[PDB]
């Protein structure tokens, strides 16, 4: 009768033209104003429910439309190294596979040629005794996460006055 | 002390290469298999909860990710004229403006040159005594609706074996 758990990691990278510090400040420090400006058709509202922005903080995205809302629980905030981690605990099941949580993580690494390399990771933690997860689902999470980051980067470039 | 209600309509059109009857059959008759194939990163599951497919039927979309699920209540089904209408009643509020319902409507009109003209309409019905709705929200609904139709059309063209 063993105890079983899966951790499934997806990693994706891309090179941003925006500097690491600006991209970091935008998402992590000004998320509450920038998320709805950069994704005005998808994110209706980004707000803080508990805490000051550091580890332990609970933030909340409300989506435009009949897509609900979701809470982010903030795990690591590292300004010096432009690194951010949070967890979502609710509404994360697939129609077949329950999840204990999803963890989202980025590190922005400054490059000379450009702004920075954006390193994004998603980790799905599985509830239960077996595992079934499809390419499309695994890729959807990483693709959405990286998309939020991309939209915030386009916004800040088109609007340096932030 | 009057009774006040707003009906806000958005209409959008585009020309499909796929014939009206194929596009209609795909969404309305085979939605349960085609929605998750055409939008495999967004729609996890499309299923019928009540009824046989005609007016009165309650269908349900489950979204990929922490985006919830939503029910469609089917109002008009017109195979002859390729016309379909349904309503969503739940989770439709904006952060400022409550809605009584959202109605979605398409008519596909066959053209000689191509497949058909896809006419899409969204109607937002407002709960309350005043009205505040922004360009971005109004456009998001119509854009999503028309997007579902576009994804189903690309799929059926790339896969005529359906
Ligand atoms: C699978 C898993 C996740 C997603 C998209 N959710 C998501 N992505 C990124 N950041 C978030 N904060 C709250 N929810 C999210 C899509 C598919
Ligand atoms: C505002 C209103 C609606 C949307 C997207 N919902 C939506 N669009 C189309 N068909 C549906 N069936 C169930 N929900 C929907 C986005 C913004
Ligand atoms: Na909403
Ligand atoms: Na889901």
UniProtKB/Swiss-Prot annotation, chains A, B:
Positions contributing to N(6)-dimethylallyladenine binding: 72, 86
Expressing tissues: Expressed in nodules, but not in leaves, stems, flowers and roots. Specifically located in the nodule cortex.
Residues annotated as binding trans-zeatin: 72, 86, 137
Keyword hit for Lyase: no
Keyword RNA-binding among record annotations: no
Keywords carried by this UniProt record: Cytokinin signaling pathway, Nodulation, Pathogenesis-related protein, Plant defense
Listed GO MF terms: abscisic acid binding; protein phosphatase inhibitor activity; signaling receptor activity
InterPro entries per UniProt: Bet_v_I/MLP (IPR000916), Bet_v_I_allergen (IPR024949), Plant_def-hormone_signal (IPR050279), START-like_dom_sf (IPR023393)
GO biological process: abscisic acid-activated signaling pathway; cytokinin-activated signaling pathway; defense response; nodulation
Induction pattern: Up-regulated during nodulation, but not by Nod factors or pathogen infection.
Pfam families linked: Bet_v_1
Cross-referenced SUPFAM superfamilies: Bet v1-like (SSF55961)
Subunit: Homodimer.
Miscellaneous remark of the record: The NT13 molecules that have dimerized without cytokinin ligand most probably lose their binding properties because it seems unlikely that the dimer can dissociate back to the monomer. Asp-66 from the complementary protein molecule forms hydrogen bonds with the cytokinin scaffold.
Family: Belongs to the BetVI family.
Annotated function: May be involved in nodule organogenesis rather in the processes related to nitrogen fixation or interactions with the bacteria. May regulate nodulation by controlling the levels of freely available cytokinins.
Name used for this protein in its record: Nodulin-13
Species for this entry: Medicago truncatula
Organism lineage: Eukaryota, Viridiplantae, Streptophyta, Embryophyta, Tracheophyta
